[PDB]
Symmetry: C3
Subunit: 616 residues, 3 copies
């Protein structure tokens, strides 16, 4: 390797080594004539034109240290569905990031009973006991007798009696720490200095938690994390699980048989993902521990709030707590409805009925459905065992503190501004009347009202989704076959003494959450002037979060989360664009919907982050 | 209790005795110089010390942006054509660009069920319109082996040969990346910069971190996984296993290895499903893509002055791939059922179809998705819309005229690609495309078969830089059944106690196994070693891990290599390059364990070079 | 305008600055009165700005080096020279090559003991026992045997060979000790404990796959299945699809046609951690995690000359890197139940069989006398060094004017613990502390007797194994008399089977730390907080893309700076307090029966002279 510092026009413009060497010759000549003993230039002299890519320089920081502090509420024993207020103690010169520790008690569902059995299916041979319900459909024309059986069993398959004991399981909604804080408010002198609701908390969940922070984020707000599990070897090189008669076959023409398995080429095991946390239904949800961060601007250390700048008399963190019925839900436990259909094909007298003779073919089909126990609901006495505000307090030297107060003047801050408009229109133009400061960007969504409805059995999951979610089942079915000869003196091949039997049993069932988007197009208009033309919602959900923000902006998973951007660097502190209001009086967000109508009302959610100023 | 001045260590990191001296001095000068306030200025402190609590920012020269979409000058768009957009006159600058492509919903044409496979066995051959049956006698063992093959749909209903059948349709992986064969930024008739799908897949591998991946996939039409949860598989203190095998102990009291016990946790499984453009469907929905144009001027800092590239001579030209490389036929609801049955008789005629005393029966059943004959893609599928979206930046007139008169020039990065087809196991390939300083080079040796029409996995392998083979993984359902056919003799130890067993394919996965095509790579330029002969994992794993930070993603593709020559690939500030003298005689040397005359490969080399752009 | 826009953009100030400068330039006689971009940038920032500054000429090239200590082996000290090449040397990575290796031939072990007390038979292929029950008429038969994957029964004492696997992250455990020697004295050094703290905290997802490939961790491969859902059809037979009861209501548990067309994805692994008959040659590029990996902090070769600079790697034993695992050998456990109703019911001679049931599991089993190859060679080991070159003019200025460089060093202490709560003095802290990795790893995680040591060795919690079963369920009915109506008859036989289709092992983590408290020279730096504060909140809040929230439930981060991972210092623990530094813990797991290691790895600030 030889370094080449000056090769033509390209190197002259990128490295400028001829100039750099000329600057050195000039600087050493001036220092020498001016009487310096050391004529070699200073590193600053070089840095006035050229950057040094190898450089160990740094600056000393004004002496600084920090320490967290727990604080209990002024409002006594904490409960669900209440307002909890913390004082911001006088401790550090500044206070910065905050996080609230919430402790929810271990809880179980009340005792219930096995519900009544389903109604009859077939019109014939109806029998109802305490343990099963049996009906049948005859068909003497085809000779097929269909028998319907439904019963209740546990996981091991033991039949459960109607009205016997049964207990539902309990689960927390997804992201319960985000839904638990109905409203979070930082107020000084009676008025809210900044505030946000659970809609902002879930907007943050979708746009500002990259994967290198996700596992801890999920743990802070009570969302279970998946755990990877490894299986036995499913492929072993040079062998196969298939029996020999079907392996490595060739047809009569020498060609390998389509559908004939061959030996595996690699040795591999399977990975599966399991969850067993707050969102998985359990007989007893263990004590839930969450550390909910407060998503205020001053979480940034550079933006730490000077303690003397706010009186201790009226400075508070005030949190409205969601109700338990929106956080904890019952779910089916160790109780399953077994639905079995059996077909018996007879060919003799009475065929198609229960008295038909000569059974040639038998088939069984069976599914299992998790079932709710009657009268088993959540424990309403579940205690909020502990809640405490953690405040990071920063300390500085007395000299710098006095200089900082007298010379800082003000600080640039960011605040939330929320508006929710109920809609039954497929298309509408919604004046944004809570938007009233320089807006950097707006989170936008059209959440169906059913996502938060107590009648939606999937509210625990759908509440934070911004789309209409339907549930598509995926079945794992075990197929079996069996043939048996009942006459040891007659050849089975081609005889009715060569019986047939088959079975399809449900092995497991998955639920695919299928999102149907609620926004087709979005338009942003201010005083009859387009800020954003009518573009497909996919432009705001996919392209804008992809192009802007760097690691501060995450492309959202939710198909309904949209980002109306007005700045060049959405995550950074340095201002880089806004829409002032200002002539923003008539600020309109116009949408088109293929989902929203009178039968499917939705909430147009628009949350903006605005710039304001705090004078210290 | 802050400390600030504990020893030499605190003296060099915080320098608090120095800072106090500077403050005490500054207060005395200002007092001596007649200032009303002697306390220093934050700038005065920051000339030596850095302030960790600082809300300072600089005002930005007023600017705002707005997107504008335009249609091509070349009329109705089609596959296999050139589409050209003019860049309209709108803002003072134009920046990031994205192209909306809309492909009509499409399905395959009607076909037929193909002919059944040939005979497997030599005996008892029967050909039906609905099944093909053969057999293999074995009088020595008494085993009659019966082979049956037929066609079924998903529900299992038999399909008649030459009856109706329709194939499904699928898109190739990353359709938005392959759709654009070439993308041109044209000025004065000269290509100012251009790239291919090869550069697009290099970007897909190296510059899409996980916090941008979901949105990136949606922009280019790649399906996104959807996580689905199952029923509870583990329930604390119970089991799915029947009691006779649960928690057994041997005669010595030790727990039986292989005897399952109750579960200790309660868990669900998570599986992932896809159902988008790449999943075969009877009808693929209207595919909407917003394909970003990966030019350098996507950076807002590097927006192009509208005056410096005049209107009327600036164009975006896009070459569109043929339809047959984007949309593909895949098997529909038609499956080949492969069944082997073995009959173990012991009486007269054992091993033939006339065997009498049947003792054991086995059935083995696999299913293979099958293409219908004469069912192909719709060649009239229209490109329903294509529009270029351009971000337009507006600035004040005062700063505009100052910047255009003073910036002089701007650095740009341009693609420079070369593809050399190889049948040599090792070769030294002169890189003739290189004319300018090179920051880094994307490298790969892609097998020609990955883009060959004869490859039925071309829809998937086209962007892979290795040789991919397909390894089946079988989910097998095993069943057993035993029945006594004589109620007067005990079953145990009697031939009246018949046996039956079945193995049915429940599902099958395809594992894409990558075989690396590059063993070692060496970089030699102007008779100078810039990279010695190093293993391919050095360029694939080590270099992307060490350099680039969040701007350089470690590639999943095992054949993606990154030859770096700068310290910070991904930043605008230059940080190293290969100079033009060496770039004009530049060699990339490889050794391969795969490439030979039976496996031709293309050595793809795409360098990112530095050039310049004058202003007006 | 107005007020808000005057403070964010100050455009009326900017225009007045422009008007002022253009006039003063005209007053002073400048030919071009239009302002300079610098003059604008003294107050306002230019969001569109293609300006850059030229860098002093500099290039880099890597170099490969073989060790001074002869042929490399396991369980040995390997030392490298740092050759003289560039003016500075920077990032380092070590290529390790481990030979392809297989287990020695062994045998099929002895069959298990009898389960039932009756009808006990032992052959070379199976062990059979039975439990009678004349009261219920159920005769239970137990059969255990060895098979391969295809189900072919294996004979006791016949040939059988174990597979081999590597521990997880073999590149991190192989380098038992990595140290940078300068003039005899270790300038900085770390262990595998520091390497796995980097694994948990400093590898974000955009670097994860290559990291795993660098240190020998297998990477999952996504695999797609056939279609499982097809719109407007179903896999279920007609008799159970879309049923309605007698009231017209759709039947609960009756499947309907699929609404979407979807296929499944699953992940498979088949690398160094997956057991194989032959583990092919393993190639790792293990990076050395020293501070001077940052190009800016590259070490001047003149200040640390050749001959007095070395990289020394202590290599772990093979028994901690390579392990045996079950091969193509499985124990089949089968239970059959025969309910008879006639004479001799509940015994082997009972007549009238109405119900048959079979339960069958398979457990992967080790072959006897099949162990790892102790002669497996370290086929190659080489040090890669990035060498940085500069012009002679700037090197001269830089060596005379830089003075010193701040460096960071690892300081580690391991404390064997049997107390449920303790106050542990951190006696290894010489220098200012930026942050501390904390962990309480059970001694059983690195125990030779722990069959899961290949996996648990780097975990900081107590790990237990929870099976998850895939079970195939079957049913069969047969009429054995063609003259009797089957419904309601004992001639209508019943049969059912549960067969294990697969089995997963879920690693269940039990945290070993409940609360942590930090006391230093009589000062509380951290009150007694829950472990989840240090594992979840602190890594989430701090560090940006340089601090990853750890997956390990036992990884704790004791932070004392504002920007961990960045070169510019942003907070530390003064040395006075560091000399009397205590970490007080509370544990639900550690006791006299469960020893644990309190692992504390501090990152400290140190200076380094130049020239």
């Amino acid at each position: 390797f030889k370094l080449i510092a000056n090769d033509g026009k390209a190197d002259r413009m990128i490295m400028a080594n001829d100039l750099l060497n000329d600057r050195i010759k000039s600087i050493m000549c001036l220092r020498a004539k001016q009487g310096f003993s050391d004529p070699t230039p200073t590193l600053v002299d070089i840095e006035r034109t050229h950057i040094l890519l190898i450089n160990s320089h740094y600056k000393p920081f004004a002496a600084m240290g920090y320490e967290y502090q727990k604080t209990r509420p002024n409002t006594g024993n904490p409960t669900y569905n209440s307002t909890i207020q913390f004082s911001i103690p006088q401790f550090g010169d500044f206070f910065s990031d905050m996080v609230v520790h919430v402790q929810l008690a271990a809880t179980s569902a009340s005792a219930g009973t096995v519900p009544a059995l389903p109604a009859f299916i077939g019109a014939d041979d109806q029998v109802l006991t305490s343990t099963s319900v049996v009906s049948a459909t005859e068909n003497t024309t085809s000779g097929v007798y269909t028998l319907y059986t439904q019963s209740y069993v546990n996981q091991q398959g033991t039949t459960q009696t109607v009205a016997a004991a049964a207990t539902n399981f309990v689960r927390y909604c997804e992201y319960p720490g985000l839904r638990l804080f109905k409203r979070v408010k930082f107020e000084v002198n009676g008025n809210p200095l900044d505030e946000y609701t659970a809609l902002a908390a879930i907007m943050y969940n979708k746009f500002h938690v990259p994967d290198f922070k996700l596992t801890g984020w999920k743990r802070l707000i009570g969302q279970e994390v998946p755990v990877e599990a490894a299986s036995n070897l499913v492929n072993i090189a040079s062998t196969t699980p298939w029996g020999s008669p079907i392996v490595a076959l060739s047809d009569v023409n020498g060609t390998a048989v389509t559908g004939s398995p061959v030996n595996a080429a690699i040795t591999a095991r399977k990975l599966t993902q399991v969850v067993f946390g707050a969102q998985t239904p359990k007989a007893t949800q263990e004590q839930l521990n969450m550390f909910v961060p407060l998503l205020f601007w001053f979480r940034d250390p550079r933006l730490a709030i000077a303690s003397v700048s706010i009186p201790y008399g009226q400075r508070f963190i005030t949190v409205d707590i969601e109700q338990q019925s929106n956080i904890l839900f019952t779910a089916p436990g160790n109780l399953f409805l077994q639905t079995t259909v059996e077909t018996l094909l007879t060919t003799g007298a009475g065929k198609g009925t229960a008295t038909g003779v000569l059974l040639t073919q038998y088939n069984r089909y069976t599914t299992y459905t998790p079932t709710l126990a009657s009268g088993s609901s959540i424990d309403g006495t579940q205690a909020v065992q502990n809640i405490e505000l953690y405040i990071n307090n920063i300390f500085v030297t007395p000299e710098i503190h006095d200089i900082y107060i007298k010379r800082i003047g003000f600080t640039l801050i960011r605040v939330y501004r929320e508006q929710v408009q109920r809609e039954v229109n497929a298309a509408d133009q919604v004046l944004q009347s809570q938007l009233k400061w320089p807006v950097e960007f707006i989170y936008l969504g059209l959440r169906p009202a059913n996502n938060i409805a107590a009648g939606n059995t999937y509210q625990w999951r759908d509440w934070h989704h911004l789309t209409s979610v339907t549930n598509e089942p995926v079945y794992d079915v075990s197929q079996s076959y069996a043939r048996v000869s009942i006459d040891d003196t007659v050849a089975p091949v081609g005889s009715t003494t060569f019986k047939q039997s088959a079975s399809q049993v449900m092995q497991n069932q998955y639920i695919v959450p299928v999102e149907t988007e609620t926004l087709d197009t979005v338009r942003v208009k201010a005083h009859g002037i387009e800020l954003y033309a009518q573009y497909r919602a996919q432009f705001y959900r996919d392209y804008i979060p992809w192009n802007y923000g760097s690691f501060n902006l995450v492309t959202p998973q939710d198909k309904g989360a949209l980002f109306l951007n007005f700045c060049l660097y959405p995550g950074t502190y340095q201002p880089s664009g806004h829409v002032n209001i200002s002539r923003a009086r008539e600020f309109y967000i116009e949408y088109t919907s293929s989902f929203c109508d009178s039968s499917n009302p939705c909430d147009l959610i628009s949350i903006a982050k605005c710039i304001n100023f705090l004078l210290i």
